[PDB]
């Protein structure tokens, strides 16, 4: 009942921190976008309507 | 209500209803005369089924 | 005088049979220890056994569960006091609440229809 | 653990010329395996 | 808890076990020690008289009216000790009395530390298996002719043998873990 | 949705072709990823539901389940690696494949546009389940349990078959999309009053209603752990999913044709909850807990108020995860104890410290502790039921008090008290046992953070 | 490299096939390609398909 | 909190109390000296003795196990055995 | 009595393989059947999955509707229109049974 | 936030008027918070926003053209009606966050005006009924299968009443 946690608390913390580094560094340097007016005929692409950059990375690349 | 009354009514009864019905329909002498007359009865009823609904 | 009820039963003392020393009683009371002593020297001679890994079974508990969930319907005989009481329990309240919920739901509906129920600030359901 | 495999007794019922034996039907006996009779 | 229950109770043990419940249920009503040490030597008097009644019938008629006098003159909240059944600490520390057959599934790492502990534990387990045969045989060779049988178990009766069935009265989880 | 499905089918080739020693890891590792592909369906980002293609669709109600159906196959295959590790290397690869087909079939049933596609796949799931229960069932009575599980569902099923072929003739297509955007209003005849019962009864049977729930206690008792997880987590909810999509038609009758079931369920909720209070078999108690907490659902899929429906969707996904967790830990005690009796095995926390934490969290999920989706669910069904008739709180109020009592009794007499003197010594906990649990609860914690995803079609 | 990793490629391959079959479903159900009312627009310059 | 007992500190207290019982002579009390056959006390005085000990050491010597605390020593090992004193 | 086997005992897999993880008897398969299950189980489903699910944008439009309300409430209030008029489908469109 | 969609009243604060020699234990602390808690943070935050403004990106708000409503939509034409049940299920939400704002705007107006909520905060509650009496009249009786056809009927069952009652008054 202790070998388990060093393994569960580890392989969560294995892929967990690089994520947390990813959410923090993106949210810090890249940042959410600011809302704007569609400029008379821009017809914005699917990715253009979402705020968070990696939340519109998935949208542009995969959906 | 659980176990006996709700098991004797729906699940078990349907078990018995059939069991008993198979016992009467499948207890046959095996003799041909008996069986055949039943063919006689059938011809008679079907003759009528046509007759009355002519 | 203490008065035992099905609960708050008669204590050991204050119990006449305790004060019974008829030969027979002291013959049962010493016969019953034997059954228990026997059973007692059949547990410890199986629980204090080195070289044992198998599960001490306590078959007295296995006779209990079988008696209580798999020896019931094989000992069911539909009598009165059993089917009258076996219908009041399944359909009794089930019919009670129907006239409890129908009457309420009908009272509600009438009032809504006639325009009295306020249904204010209720924007959810 | 030994998932209970059927014992001889569970098997016994399936013998007999009729599964659910009747009052007089039970009196019957299973058909000869060779499909040939002794009479 | 240690010794085995007798089948039937005698007259004496019933009388002498009232002298306990009674005097101990007199120290709830009479809390102060003086009042007690007084109101109690007066209790013995009650038991002291009617001590030599030879008329059993009578004796069992004083006892049966004593235990009804007592039932109606008992304290609802007596003084039951802290660690005794019905007490305030009864079975409190049982959450720490693990049953000792559990140190057998420990990882070789855990048992690596605590080294001499397991060196002595393996000795005792050798003692247990080394006598089960002589024990059970004893338990049996000494099965008194079939008849009354009580839960009392025999002593050793020979050098080297260990009291029959001794692995769980010895090796019993310590009281206060 | 053929990635949640085709890659699944391919699992079958992998269970068979793979090495006997490596068969378990290839299958479990791959379906974990199969679940990851399943998560893509959650990307809605708009009201219009997702019609992948003619036959395959996923709307808010199905999506929360397809993911659960894909999620449990990994877990089911991890909970049955112990028992079923005593087999001949071809009995295993059959069990693994059987489990694989269940979610292939269940994924499709939950992701099916044509209602009769639901029926064919709906009633097919019995084949894999009956094999899992009867072939590997430990007790002498599984032959019986299998019969009960096949007949109660089958006798209900043929009426639905007649009803759906009937509506196709009446409307002209069993396509859930169209049937919704078309005018199918029953006319409160005596016959329609039968149609409604025909369509709902088959769904009401596998969603144990108080009247026909005897199949579920008997089935889960002797069923192997993987079968009991499937029956509680995905199999019973097949009945609920069906009632949500089928009552789009039969719109007018349920206003007045539901009273019988609603009362059957709410009184049933109390009695099923109560008999849990004194049942010696732990698997028995969890099963009746499942009947009562599913009796609440048939009483929300019938009141038909927006909140009911998503109360239902919340509770079904939540109770599914919780029940399995309870059935999974019950098995861990059963394998070491070797008996289902609740009275034996007292004091385990003293010897299995963590499993007890999992037991405690599972019980708190079982009863309604508040920062849990389980409570949000009941709170909502409770609200609507109150709206239907303020008196409903009394019956849905005796159930809450009873539900607290049996949930804690399972913890109090199984995981507390003095340790059992010397049952076969209880070997320590495997890491698989604990993960199989962690895998159940970590998702329960994560879903409770953002309940919106499992809220249903209504909201 | 097909030595016990041709097993490991079975499911990964099923995904690929799956997506293919799936993206060949879109190609079929492409009527109303851009003829829907809410989303009808003039193909912007250099775009022959609104959604592929 | 308090210090654990010893097989000679659980023996000096048991002799102490008894030496304060007026009937039991304080110069003929010896640990191997039976209460009823050697010292003279009656049956009712055994109950009273045991009870003193139950109040000197703060625990209850059960009835059946205390109908036999005869020797003034059985009391000293029984108390210790019940309290786990291995000296 | 018929011939049949004597009850098979269940092994203490923890007696050999004292590092038993519960998956298989021989040690290497066990290690490689947890090193791949904790990983594919926790490390890239509970983590990468929750990451992706968290970033699904404006799920079911409820991030869009809290703005559209704001410009409708902005527009309706400033132009003096009722914030939520009481009929939605305009009465003019309806052709009530005359 | 749009000071106009989420309004907020101007602030009126009584000025400091100490009448005691003792030193206020609050003013000193703040003077610290402002240096050891705010300045440190303030510094970081800015540095955030300049990192943002370098590669400043934008996101728009999909504007949905208005399609024909069920009221005008052929019967049985699953195409048109599908595009028109969405246009409504969409406005079933836009007409729901509006009601979310009045739920909110009010809540604030009873925290900002305690002991006066009975009165000062009646600009809203008059609105919370002007908006609730409408939401009740267009979306409430409906089942969980809310559809534009049913709002079309919930209305039109009552348009009889605003025509039978009216005619009745005669
Ligand atoms: C001197 C020191 C000064 C320090 C100043 C701050 C420095 C700083 O860090 O800059 C802020 C900067 C972000 O702030 P920002 O750039 O100004 O704006 C952020 C965006 O607005 C928003 O960006 P975002 O939302 O994409 O990123 C944050 C987001 C990222 O999200 C994730 O991480 C997704 C999950 C990843 C899992 C990985 C494993 O975290 C969350 O959303 C947390 C959600 C809530 C989690 C806790 C549960 C709440 C509900 C509890 C349930 C019970 C409720 C009961 C209610 C009852 C009511 C009745 O960097 C970050 O803090 C990023 C945080 C990422 C956290 C990831 C790990 C989360 C776990
Ligand atoms: C509304 C809810 C309705 C629920 C209906 C449940 C139907 C199944 C209930 C349980 C049936 C059952 O237990 O069958 C057992 C019965 C006897 O079988 P058994 O005792 O195993 O004997 C064979 C070995 N000699 O086997 C039988 O005799 C037949 C039992 C019924 C089989 C299906 C009947 C369908 C009838 C449709 C009309
Ligand atoms: C429809 C299903 C009907 C099932 C029962 C059919 C027969 C019912 C009946 O009237 O008698 C039972 C019949 C004869 O009785 P038996 O079972 O032999 O034993 C009697 C003493 N216990 O039982 C039998 O021996 C079997 C009889 C089968 C044939 C009779 C049923 C014919 C039904 C009408 C057919 C019309 C055809 C027209 C051409
Ligand atoms: C334990 C908490 C109990 C809380 C009780 C709260 C009572 C609230 C007040 C109820 C009475 C005044 C109601 C006034 C407004 C509602 C008016 C209405 O429409 O109710 C009608 C209803 C008629 O019901 P009925 O008697 O069936 O009429 C049949 C006629 N042919 O009239 C009735 O509603 C009759 C029933 C009133 C009380 C409801 C039933 C309470 C029963 C509690 C049982 C608890 C145990 C339940 C079983 C499980 C445990 C064994
Ligand atoms: C047990 C679980 C619950 C079973 C319920 C079974 C109900 C009866 C079978 C299915 C009934 C049904 O499909 O309902 C609709 C059907 C036709 O109704 P309708 O559309 O009005 O067509 C008649 C001409 N207008 O109406 C019917 O088909 C009524 C048929 C009644 C007799 C069918 C055989 C019953 C056997 C028992
Ligand atoms: C297992 C049960 C656990 C405890 C549950 C306690 C809550 C049960 C509530 C059930 C009933 C909810 C209300 C149902 C509608 C009752 C009729 C109604 O419209 O309510 C208004 C009524 C006040 O109306 P008034 O004109 O003053 O006349 C009194 C009689 N109506 O006001 C009422 O009379 C409401 C009816 C009772 C509501 C409060 C119940 C308090 C229960 C106290 C403990 C009772 C024993 C438990
Ligand atoms: C607290 C409330 C106290 C109320 C208690 C109640 O009064 C009880 C009282 O005092 S009433 C005592 C009378 N109790 C007897 O009279 C039994 C006498 N029994 C004999 O005399 C035997 O013949 C025997 C020889 C065995 C005695 O020998 P021994 O002394 O027990 O060892």
For chain B, what is the total number of helices (H) and then of strands (E)?
Answer: 3, 0
Q: How far apart are CA F223 and CA F214, in angstroms?
A: 14
Residues, chain H, total?
Answer: 87
Contact, F209 vs F170, CB < 8 A? no
3-class state of residue F58 by DSSP: strand
Extents of the domains making up chain G: 1-50
Residues contacting C9, CB < 8 A, separation 6+: none
Which tokens sit at F108? Answer: 């499709």
Find, in chain F, the residue whose alpha carbon is nearest to that of C119: F387
Instruction: Verify whether ligand 7 is closer than 6 Å to residue E93 (CB atom).
Output: no
CA distance E95 to E93: 5
Q: Which of F459, F159, F175, F152 is nearest to F313 (CA)?
A: F459
Q: Which atom of ligand 3 is nearest to the CA of B45?
A: 38
Nearest alpha carbon to residue E140 among E111, E165, E177: E165
How remote is the CA of residue C100 from the centroid of ligand 6, in Å? Answer: 14
DSSP code for F341: B
For the CA of F390, the nearest atom of ligand 6:
14
Which contiguous run of DSSP H or E holds residue J59? strand J58-59
Q: Are I34 and I23 in contact (CB under 8 A)?
A: yes
CA distance J104 to J6: 9
Alpha-carbon gap: J136 to the closest alpha carbon of chain C (Å) = 6
Find the Cα–Cα–Cα–Cα dihedral E143, E147, E152, E158, rounded to 10°. Answer: -20
Cβ(H8)–Cβ(H86) under 8 Å?
no
Rounded-to-integer distance, Cα I21 and Cα I29, Å: 10
User: A15 touching F, CB under 8 A?
Assistant: no
For residues F338 and C55, the answer to whether their CB atoms sit within 8 Å is yes
Nearest residue to A53 (alpha-carbon basis) of F46, J1, F45, J55: J55
Three-state secondary-structure class, residue A13: helix
Closest approach of J119 to chain I, Cα-based (Å)? 22
F446 contacts F298 by C-beta, under 8 angstroms: no
SS3 label, residue F281 = strand
Segment 36-75 of chain F within 8 Å of chain G by CB: 37, 52-54
Nearest Cα to Cα of residue F53 among F122, F92, F111, F116: F111
Helices (H), F172-212: 176-180, 192-206
J103-134 in b/e burial notation, b at 16+ Cβ within 10 A?
Answer: eebbeebeeeeeeebeeebeebbebbeebbeb
What's the angle, vertex CA F103, arms to CA F97 and CA F107, rounded to 5?
145
If you measure from the C-alpha of residue E6 to the centroid of ligand 7, how many angstroms do you get, rounded to a whole number? 21
Packing angle, helices F259-277 and F282-295, rounded to 10: 150
Give the position of tokens 């290397």.
F89
Residue with tokens 């914030």: I83
CA angle G37, G39, G45 (to 5 degrees): 125
**Helix extents (H) in F341-419:** 353-366, 373-388, 392-414
Q: Which two structure tokens, joined as six digits, stand for J33?
A: 């918070």
Chain length of chain A: 63
Locate H33 and state its tokens.
């000296």
SS (H, E, C) G8-39: CCHHHHHHHHHHHHHHHHHCCCCCCCCCCCCC
Residues after which a C–N gap over 2.5 Å breaks chain J:
none
Q: State the DSSP H helix or E strand holding residue J58, giving kind and residue range, or none if neither.
A: strand J58-59
Within 8 A of C54 by CB-CB distance, chain I residues are 9
Q: Measured in angstroms, how far is the CA atom of residue A31 from the centroid of ligand 1? A: 13
Q: Is J130 on the interface with I (CB under 8 A)?
A: yes
Is I70 within 8 Å of J5 (Cβ atoms)? yes
Domain ranges of chain B: 1-54
Q: Which residues of F413-439 are buried (b: 16+ CB within 10 A; e: fewer)?
A: bbbbbebbebbbbbbbbbbbbbbbbbb
In total, chain C counts a number of residues equal to 125
Q: By what method was this entry solved?
A: cryo-EM
Give dist(CA J135, CA F74) in Å, integer: 46
SS3 G6: coil
Least distant ligand from the CA of F263: 4
Give the integer Cα–Cα distance in Å for H33 and H15. 11
Domain residue spans of chain H:
2-87
> Would you call F53 helix, strand, or coil by DSSP?
coil
Q: Which two tokens stand for residue C40?
A: 């007692």
Tokens matching residue J7: 């309004």
Q: How many CB atoms lie within 10 A of CB C3?
A: 6
Strand runs labelled E in A1-63: 34-35
Structure tokens at H11: 């023996």
CA E38, CA E35: separation in Å to the nearest integer?
Answer: 5
Ligand number nearest to the C-alpha of B23: 3
DSSP E74: -
- Compute φ and ψ for F177, nearest 5 degrees: -60, -50
Closest CA to F108 of F65, F50, F60, F77: F65
CB count in 10 Å sphere of residue A15: 18
Contact status of J90 with chain F (Cβ, < 8 Å): yes
Closest CA to F200 of F159, F243, F250: F243
Which of F376, F73, F344, F63 has its CA nearest to residue F230?
A: F73
Secondary structure percentages of chain I, helix, strand, coil, to 5: 45, 0, 55
Residue of F nearest to A1 (CA): F354
F191 touches ligand 5 (CB under 6 Å): yes
CA distance F273 to F263: 15
* Backbone Cα Rg of chain G: 18
- Phi, then psi, of F58 in degrees rounded to 5: -140, 115
Q: Which residue has the tokens 């196990």?
A: H65
The Cα J96–Cα J140 span in angstroms is 12
Do F313 and F457 touch, CB atoms closer than 8 A?
yes
* Sheet strands (E) in A1-45: 34-35
**Which tokens sit at J167?**
């005619």
C73/B6 CB distance under 8 A: no
Comparing CA positions, the residue from F372, F351, F366, F358 lying closest to residue F328 is F358
Which of E15, E16, E35 should be mutated for ligand 7, with most atoms under 8 A from CB? Answer: E15
Of chain I, the end-to-end C-alpha distance in Å amounts to 91
Tell me whether J157 touches chain C (CB under 8 Å).
no
DSSP letters, chain C, are: -----SSSPPPSTT-GGGS---TTHHHHHHHHHHHHHHHHHHHHHHHS-TT--S----HHHHHHHHHHHSSSGGG----TTTSSTTTTTTTHHHHHTHHHHHHHHHHHHHHHHHT-----S----
Instruction: Give the number of other CB atoms < 10 A from CB of residue J153.
Output: 13
| Chain C residues 1-60 with a CB less than 8 Å from chain E | 1-2, 11, 13-14, 16, 19, 21, 25-26, 29-30, 32-34, 36-38, 40-41, 44-45, 47-51
Separation CA F378–CA I52 (nearest Å): 29
Cα–Cα distance measured from residue A51 to residue A58, given in angstroms and rounded to the nearest whole number: 12
């Amino acid at each position: 009942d202790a070998r388990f946690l060093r393994l569960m608390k580890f392989y969560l913390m294995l892929t967990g921190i690089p994520v947390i580094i990813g959410i923090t560094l993106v949210n810090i340097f890249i940042g959410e976008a600011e809302l704007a007016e569609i400029p008379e005929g821009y017809i914005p692409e699917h990715w253009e309507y979402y705020k968070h950059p990696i939340s519109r990375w998935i949208a542009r690349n995969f959906y | 209500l659980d176990l006996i009354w709700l098991e004797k009514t729906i699940p078990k009864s349907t078990s018995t209803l059939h069991t008993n019905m198979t016992t009467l329909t499948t207890n046959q002498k095996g003799l041909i005369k008996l069986y055949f007359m039943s063919f006689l009865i059938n011809i008679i009823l079907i003759i009528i089924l046509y007759s009355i609904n002519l | 005088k203490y008065k035992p009820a099905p609960l708050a039963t008669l204590p050991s003392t204050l119990d006449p049979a305790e004060y019974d020393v008829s030969p027979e009683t002291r013959r049962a009371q010493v016969e019953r220890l034997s059954i228990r002593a026997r059973l007692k020297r059949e547990y410890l001679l199986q629980y204090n056994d080195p070289k044992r890994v198998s599960h001490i079974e306590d078959p007295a508990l296995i006779r209990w569960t079988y008696a209580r969930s798999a020896n019931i319907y094989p000992n069911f005989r539909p009598t009165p006091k059993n089917s009258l009481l076996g219908a009041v329990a399944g359909f009794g309240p089930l019919i009670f609440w129907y006239y409890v919920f129908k009457t309420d739901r009908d009272r509600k509906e009438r009032l809504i229809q006639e325009g009295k129920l306020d249904r204010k600030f209720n924007i959810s359901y | 653990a030994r998932q209970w495999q059927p014992d001889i007794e569970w098997a016994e019922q399936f013998s007999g010329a009729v599964m659910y034996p009747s009052k007089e039907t039970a009196h019957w006996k299973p058909p000869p395996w060779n499909d040939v009779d002794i009479l | 808890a240690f010794c085995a229950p007798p089948a039937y109770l005698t007259h004496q043990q019933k009388v002498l076990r009232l002298y306990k419940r009674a005097l101990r249920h007199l120290e709830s009503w009479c809390i102060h020690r003086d009042k007690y040490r007084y109101f109690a030597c007066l209790m013995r008097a009650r038991f002291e008289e009617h001590k030599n009644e030879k008329d059993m019938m009578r004796a069992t008629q004083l006892l049966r009216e004593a235990e009804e006098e007592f039932w109606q003159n008992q304290h609802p909240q007596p003084y039951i000790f802290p660690d005794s059944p019905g007490g305030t600490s009864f079975e409190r520390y049982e959450c720490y009395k693990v049953p000792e057959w559990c140190l057998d599934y420990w990882h070789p790492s855990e048992k690596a530390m605590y080294p001499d502990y397991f060196s002595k534990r393996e000795q005792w387990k050798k003692l247990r298996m080394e006598s089960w045969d002589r024990e059970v045989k004893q338990l049996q060779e000494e099965t008194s002719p079939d008849g009354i049988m009580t839960e009392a178990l025999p002593p050793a009766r020979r050098e080297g043998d260990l009291p029959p069935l001794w692995w769980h009265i010895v090796t019993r989880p310590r009281e206060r873990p | 949705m053929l990635k949640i499905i085709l890659p699944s089918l391919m699992l079958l080739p992998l269970t068979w072709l793979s090495s006997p020693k490596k068969t378990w890891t290839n299958v479990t590792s791959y379906s974990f990823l199969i679940s990851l592909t399943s998560l893509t369906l959650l990307w809605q980002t708009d009201e219009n539901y997702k019609n992948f293609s003619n036959m395959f669709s996923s709307d808010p109600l199905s999506t929360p389940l397809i993911i659960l159906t894909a999620w449990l196959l990994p877990l089911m295959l991890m909970a049955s690696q112990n028992h079923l590790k005593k087999d001949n290397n071809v009995l295993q690869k059959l069990y693994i494949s059987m489990l694989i087909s269940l979610q292939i079939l269940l994924i499709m049933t939950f992701s099916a546009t044509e209602l009769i596609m639901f029926y064919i796949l709906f009633e097919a799931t019995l084949i894999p389940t009956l094999i899992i229960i009867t072939r590997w069932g430990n007790q002498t009575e599984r032959l019986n349990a299998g019969i009960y599980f096949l007949f109660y569902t089958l006798i209900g099923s043929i009426p639905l078959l007649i009803a759906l072929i009937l509506i196709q003739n009446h409307v002209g297509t069993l396509n859930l999309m169209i049937l919704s955007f078309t005018t199918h209003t029953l006319d409160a005849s005596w016959s329609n009053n039968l149609l409604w019962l025909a369509c709902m009864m088959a769904f009401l049977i596998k969603m144990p209603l108080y009247g026909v729930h005897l199949w579920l206690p008997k089935a889960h008792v002797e069923a192997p752990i993987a079968g009991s997880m499937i029956l509680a987590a995905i199999l019973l909810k097949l009945g609920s999913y069906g009632m949500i999509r089928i009552s789009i038609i039969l719109d007018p009758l349920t206003k007045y044709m539901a009273y019988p079931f609603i009362l059957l369920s709410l009184w049933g909720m109390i009695m099923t909850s109560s008999i849990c209070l004194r049942q010696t078999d732990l698997k028995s108690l969890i099963a009746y807990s499942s009947v009562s907490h599913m009796a609440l659902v048939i009483a929300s899929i019938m009141i038909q108020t927006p909140w009911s429906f998503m109360g239902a969707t919340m509770l079904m996904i939540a109770h599914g995860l919780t029940s399995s967790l309870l059935f999974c830990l019950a098995n861990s005690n059963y394998e070491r104890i070797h008996s289902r009796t609740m009275i034996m095995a007292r004091g385990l926390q003293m010897v299995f410290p963590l499993m007890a934490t999992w037991w405690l969290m599972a019980s708190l999920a079982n009863l309604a502790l508040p920062p849990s989706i389980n409570l949000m669910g009941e709170l909502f069904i409770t609200m609507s039921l109150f709206s239907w008739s303020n008196f409903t709180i009394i019956l849905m109020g005796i159930n809450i008090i009873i539900t607290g009592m049996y949930s804690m009794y399972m913890i109090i007499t199984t995981q507390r008290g003095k340790l059992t003197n010397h049952m076969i010594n209880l070997q320590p906990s495997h890491t698989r046992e604990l993960t199989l649990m962690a895998l159940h609860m970590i998702p329960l914690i994560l879903l409770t953070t953002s309940p919106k995803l499992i809220t249903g079609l209504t909201m | 490299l097909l030595r016990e990793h041709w097993v490991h490629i079975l499911v990964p391959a099923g995904f690929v096939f799956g997506c293919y079959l799936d993206r060949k479903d879109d190609e079929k159900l492409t009527a109303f390609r851009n003829k829907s009312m809410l989303f009808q627009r003039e193909l912007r310059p250099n775009e022959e398909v609104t959604w592929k | 909190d308090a210090p654990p007992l010893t097989l000679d500190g659980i023996k000096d207290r048991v002799l102490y109390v008894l030496k304060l019982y007026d009937k039991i002579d304080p110069e003929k009390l010896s640990v191997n000296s039976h209460f009823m056959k050697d010292l003279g006390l009656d049956s009712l005085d055994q109950v009273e003795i045991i009870m003193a000990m139950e109040d000197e050491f703060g625990f209850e010597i059960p009835d059946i196990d205390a109908e036999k605390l005869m020797c003034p020593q059985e009391i000293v090992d029984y108390i210790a055995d019940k309290k786990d004193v291995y000296e | 009595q018929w011939q049949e086997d004597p009850e098979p005992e269940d092994e203490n897999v923890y007696a050999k393989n004292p590092d038993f993880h519960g998956y298989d008897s021989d040690p290497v398969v066990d290690v490689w059947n947890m090193r791949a299950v904790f990983f594919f189980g926790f490390s890239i489903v509970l983590v990468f999955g929750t990451t992706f699910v968290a970033y699904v944008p404006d799920y079911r439009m409820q991030e869009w509707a809290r703005r559209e309300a704001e410009r409708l409430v902005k527009y309706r209030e400033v132009n003096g229109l009722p914030i939520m008029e009481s009929n939605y489908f305009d009465p003019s469109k309806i052709q009530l049974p005359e | 936030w749009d000071k106009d969609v989420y309004p907020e009243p101007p602030s009126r604060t009584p000025a400091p008027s100490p009448q005691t020699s003792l030193p206020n234990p609050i003013t000193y602390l703040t003077k610290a918070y402002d240096l050891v808690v705010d300045w440190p943070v303030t510094l970081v935050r800015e540095f955030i926003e300049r990192q943002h403004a370098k590669n400043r990106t934008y996101y728009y708000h999909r504007q949905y053209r208005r399609v024909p409503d069920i009221t005008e939509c052929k019967e049985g034409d699953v195409l048109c009606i599908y595009e028109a049940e969405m246009q409504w299920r969409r406005d079933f939400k836009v007409d729901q966050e509006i009601m979310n704002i009045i739920q909110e705007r009010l809540k604030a107006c009873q925290q900002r005006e305690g002991e006066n909520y009975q009165q000062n905060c009646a600009k809203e509650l008059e609105q919370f009924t002007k908006v609730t009496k409408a939401y009740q009249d267009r979306y409430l009786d409906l089942g969980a299968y809310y559809s534009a056809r049913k709002c079309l009927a919930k209305q039109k069952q009552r348009m009889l009443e605003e025509r039978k009652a009216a005619r009745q008054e005669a």
